[PDB]
Structures are given as structure tokens and as C-alpha cells.
Amino acid sequence: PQIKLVLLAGVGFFLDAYDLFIINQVAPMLAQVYFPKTGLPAQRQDLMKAAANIGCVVGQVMFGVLGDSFGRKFVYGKELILIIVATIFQMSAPSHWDGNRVLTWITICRVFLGIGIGGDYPMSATVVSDRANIHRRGTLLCFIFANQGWGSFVGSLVTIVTISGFKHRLKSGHTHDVDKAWRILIGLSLIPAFGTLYQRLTGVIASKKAHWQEFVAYFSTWNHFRNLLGSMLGWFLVDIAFYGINLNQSVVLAQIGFAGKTGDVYDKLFQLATGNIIVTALGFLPGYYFTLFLIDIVGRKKLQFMGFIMSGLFLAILAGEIDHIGKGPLLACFTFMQFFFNFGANTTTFIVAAELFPTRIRASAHGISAAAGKCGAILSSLVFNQLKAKIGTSAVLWIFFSTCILGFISTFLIDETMGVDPDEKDLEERRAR
Ligand SMILES: CCCCCCCCCO[C@@H]1O[C@H](CO)[C@@H](O)[C@H](O)[C@H]1O
Ligand SMILES: CCCCCCCCCO[C@@H]1O[C@H](CO)[C@@H](O)[C@H](O)[C@H]1O
Ligand SMILES: CCCCCCCCCO[C@@H]1O[C@H](CO)[C@@H](O)[C@H](O)[C@H]1O
């Protein structure tokens, strides 16, 4: 039936999300091995974490040209082997290498990993926004998207299971085995990746200039232009805070009480992994499901308004209190923030970009919005740990706060898409003039 295809798109998101966010769990292990006394150098850590998102935009433009030039049959398999191969190179950095060289190895691998993650990313959204043509398209897009939560959660679960498996060996003095742990964290993605590879198998300028002419004509009208403006702005603005925080969740949990001077190597990695699992289990993950049950009841806009403005509050509390109040209150607010990312702006920007636009131009408008998002992701990703050193963590969280208020403001540019057919509205718009 139609069901099996949406699951396959789901496992595509799951694998993309796992590979993206697992770097947050891998980085503190790389620190313990290759930079035990100092931290990972700020610029190198930022480059390593932005790498996958940088490749992600290169992927969907490149796999876009090839997919348009020679059709969908050209791309469907090749994107997945690229992330499999990129996973294996990343997994197998020479252990006898110098720390900066190991880091540079992983960043480059993660760019190519990103290029593949850039493959199926918008194509899993289109297949069911085109297919459904029903009020329950939002509940469907949201169900596919929720696999981003499971990607981050399973990575955290994999991490505590892995560390607690190495418990006795680390306690008995074999401290280099954390170099084997971080390879297992990346490597375990290969199990669904190979599973899915097998399941997936078992006048060009004249046309482009004609589509460009329709696109420009469409988005040169205000009530049509602002919907593209608001779609680009909302996705751009939320990804600054969202990927800034989530690619560095282990870093924030370290000003909060979860990193300390007490305890040994196991005690360190294990409470830090304990902090990560709490946040994603209690906040990051359930937010997707609160959205799932309410988008086709409350509407998309009311959920972004709430999402931006609620995550703003907890960012302001973090920014104001992080250096001044105890662990507990901060851990709660940080979890509340994560909850209202996914019960809110992060989930709705994705749906709104897929739902706003009539099909005759939907491909570009969704692509331009997704590209705008990745731009916001790479700014914070490229600079988060550098700013944290130049201006401090509280000052960065004040920046994230401001982007949430701008997101709230920009959401007024959008039409509510709950229950609307964008092709019909385009249709009456035209029969009306
Ligand atoms: C599926 C795609 C696979 C991509 C894997 C390519 C890894 C690139 C290897 O990096 C190279 O090795 C050293 C890194 O420390 C440096 O000598 C050199 O500057 C750098 O270019
Ligand atoms: C399709 C190309 C795939 C090539 C994979 C070759 C892997 C060779 C083994 O690598 C080794 O991995 C160990 C940790 O796992 C490190 O201790 C060691 O330094 C490194 O040499
Ligand atoms: C100098 C900055 C000024 C920009 C002003 C904000 C633009 C608001 C656009 O109004 C729009 O009118 C539509 C009805 O036609 C509503 O459906 C939609 O919700 C609403 O967003």
C-alpha cells in the first residue's frame, strides 16, 4: 500500500538526523582522546560541526542538477552510498594520528556525508505533500519529520549503552578505549543504512529560463512575495538557535552542572551522556508529538507564534541566569526550550514551506526555503564555540533570544495553511482576475 513509502522516507530522516546530531556525542570523546588537557580548538570544533550542514546545501543543489538533468532514476541510490562511504572513512581515522589532523580528517568526511544527507532531504517532503491533497497532510508530514527526534534520541541512547558497556574496562585503566567508543557511535548508523540500501533496490536552458520567468512573475506580487519572504525568514531564523544549540548541546550542558572537577573518565562521559539523554527524552522528542496531535487542530501559525515566543522566554532565562543560578532550574529551562523548538517553530517551518506554495513553483519555493534554513544552521554552527570564547555563553544566548523574537515578528507574513489547497487558491486567485 501507500504506507510503506512514507516509512521509507521516515527511515531516511532518521538516518540523516542520527548522522547529523551524533557529532554532539562524538566531540567530547574526541576531546578526551586527542585533547585531554585543553578543549577542542574552537574554530576546528565549529568547522567539524558545521561540516555536515555545509555539505547538506551542496548536496541538494548538486543532486538537484543531476536529478533534473537526467531524472529521478539517476539519484535514488547514489545518495545513500555516499553517506555510507563517508561514514566508513570518518569511522576509520588512523588512531596514531595527530589531534588536529584527526579533526581535519573528520570534518572533510562529514562534508561528503553532508552532500549525501543533502540528497533525499527535500524529496521526502514533496512526495506526500503532492500525494495527500487532504487536510491530513500535516499530520503526515509531521509524522515523517518526527524521525529527527528519534535520530537524536537513539544517538543518545546508543551513547549511554556504549559507555556503560565500557564501564569496567575504563575503570580498570584502559582509558584509550574511548577512542573505540566514538567510532562505534558513528558506525552503528551503518546497520539501517545498509538495510535501506538493499530495500531501495529490492532545451535544458530554454526550459529553465521559462520556469524562471513564471517564478519571477509569481513572487513579484506582494501577497505572493511575503509568503516566500516569511517562509525563508522563519526557517532561517529558527535554524540559527536550533542547530547552534543541538550541535553543541554537550557544550551547554557543561556550563550547567553536568561537567565538573570531581570523578574519573567514566564518571565524566557517563553523567554528560546522562544529561544529554534527559534533555532529548523529556523535551526534544515529545515536542514533535505535541505538534503532531495539534497542527490540524490549532493551525500552523499559532504553533509558530507560540514556538518562537516560548523558546525565546527560556533562552532569555538561560541568558540571564546561567552564570547565577543552580543546575536544576537551568536544566529544566533548557529542556523546556528544546520542547518548544519541536513543539513549535522547528517543525512548523518545515510544514509551512511544503504547504504554502502551489505545485507549479513548489519545487523552487520549498528548495529556497530549505536552503535559507541551512544558511542559518551554518552561521551558528560555524561560529558558536568561537563566540562562546570571545563574548561568553550568556551573550550568545541573548543573540539566540533576539532571533526568536524576529522569528515571532516574521511569522505575521504567513498565511495559515491548515485545511487549504494551495493549488485551488492559486486557481481562484486567477479565475478572479
Ligand atoms: C565518501 C567521500 C570520502 C571522502 C574522504 C576524503 C578524506 C580527505 C582526506 O583528507 C586529507 O588527509 C589529511 C587530513 O588530515 C590532509 O593531508 C589533507 O589536507 C586532506 O585533504
Ligand atoms: C572502502 C574503504 C574502507 C577502508 C577501511 C580500512 C580500515 C583500515 C583499519 O583502519 C584502522 O581503524 C582503527 C580503528 O578502527 C585504527 O586504530 C587504525 O589507526 C586504523 O588504521
Ligand atoms: C515595513 C514593514 C511592514 C510589513 C508589514 C507586515 C506585512 C503584513 C502582511 O499582511 C498580511 O495580510 C493578509 C491578508 O491579505 C493576511 O492573511 C496575512 O496574515 C498578513 O500577514
- Determine the Cα–Cα distance for residues 58 and 114; give it in Å rounded to an integer: 8
Ligand 2 atom nearest to CA at 91:
15
Q: How far is the CA of 200 from the centre of ligand 2 (A)?
A: 28
Take residue 413 and report the three cell numbers written for it: 507574513
First to last CA, the chain: 41
Cβ of 92 below 6 Å from ligand 2: yes
Angle formed at CA 297 by CA 335 and CA 128, multiple of 5 degrees: 90
- Determine the Cα–Cα distance for residues 35 and 401; give it in Å rounded to an integer: 32
Q: How far is the CA of 94 from the centre of ligand 2 (A)?
A: 6
Number of domains in the chain: 1
Determine contact, residues 163/33, Cβ cutoff 8 Å.
no
Number of separate helices (H) and strands (E) present in the chain: 23, 0
- Determine the Cα–Cα distance for residues 188 and 88; give it in Å rounded to an integer: 11
Q: How far is the CA of 91 from the centre of ligand 1 (A)?
A: 13
Determine contact, residues 120/11, Cβ cutoff 8 Å.
no
Determine contact, residues 55/106, Cβ cutoff 8 Å.
no
Determine contact, residues 113/59, Cβ cutoff 8 Å.
no
- Determine the Cα–Cα distance for residues 48 and 103; give it in Å rounded to an integer: 7
Pick from 54, 72, 52: which is nearest to 127 by CA?
72
Domain of 233, in residue numbers: 1-433
CA distances to 9, 96, 345, 409 from 301, rounded to whole Å, are 25, 53, 9, 12
Within 10 angstroms of residue 169's Cβ, the number of other Cβ atoms is 14
CA distances to 63, 72, 211, 359, 362 from 205, rounded to whole Å, are 18, 19, 10, 21, 20
Which structural technique was applied? X-ray
Amino acid at 263: G
Cβ of 226 below 6 Å from ligand 3: yes
- Determine the Cα–Cα distance for residues 26 and 179; give it in Å rounded to an integer: 10
